[PDB]
Amino acid sequence: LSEQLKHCNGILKELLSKKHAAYAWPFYKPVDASALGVHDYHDIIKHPMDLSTVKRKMENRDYRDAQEFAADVRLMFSNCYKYNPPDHDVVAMARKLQDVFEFRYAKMP
Numbered sequence: 001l002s003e004q005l006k007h008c009n010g011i012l013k014e015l016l017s018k019k020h021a022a023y024a025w026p027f028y029k030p031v032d033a034s035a036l037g038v039h040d041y042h043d044i045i046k047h048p049m050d051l052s053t054v055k056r057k058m059e060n061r062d063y064r065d066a067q068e069f070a071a072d073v074r075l076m077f078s079n080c081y082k083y084n085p086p087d088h089d090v091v092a093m094a095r096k097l098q099d100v101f102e103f104r105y106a107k108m109p
């Protein structure tokens, strides 16, 4: 991994760590639309994303730069903001995790 991608990997590890689990947990695995009963999810969200998918892409060296990584993490939050009402509990969690993400991403070497 490039130096910037190492920073990205560090951010990813932090997002998945116990420190943030109280608000990060919904983002750990792909949304299971059937399990959650959200039968319109895949009509509304054309490009699902979640932290396990970002992790697999990082491990496989799929991301060629920090910008590509950040686009995926941001897509994950955007999908949450698109599907859910802005006052929803999961949206509040998304905002908190995105704050953690954006502030550390801003510290890119």
Ligand SMILES: CCNC(=O)[C@H](C)[C@@H]1N=C(c2ccc(Cl)cc2)c2cc(OC)ccc2-n2c(C)nnc21
Residues within 6 Å of the ligand: 025, 026, 027, 031, 032, 036, 038, 041, 079, 080, 083, 084, 089, 090
């Ligand atoms: C109809 C209620 N809304 C949902 O079920 C959405 C689809 C779902 N909510 C939730 C969700 C709803 C309430 C709370 Cl407190 C936390 C997460 C959710 C739950 C999950 O459990 C494994 C996984 C993903 C989500 N999730 C994410 C991420 N983005 N939207 C959601």
Ligand SMILES: C[C@H](O)COC[C@H](C)O
Residues within 6 Å of the ligand: 095, 098, 099, 102, 103
């Ligand atoms: C609340 C917005 O959806 C995300 O804001 C991120 C900022 C770093 O708090």
Ligand SMILES: [Cl-]
Residues within 6 Å of the ligand: 070, 071, 074
């Ligand atoms: Cl972006």
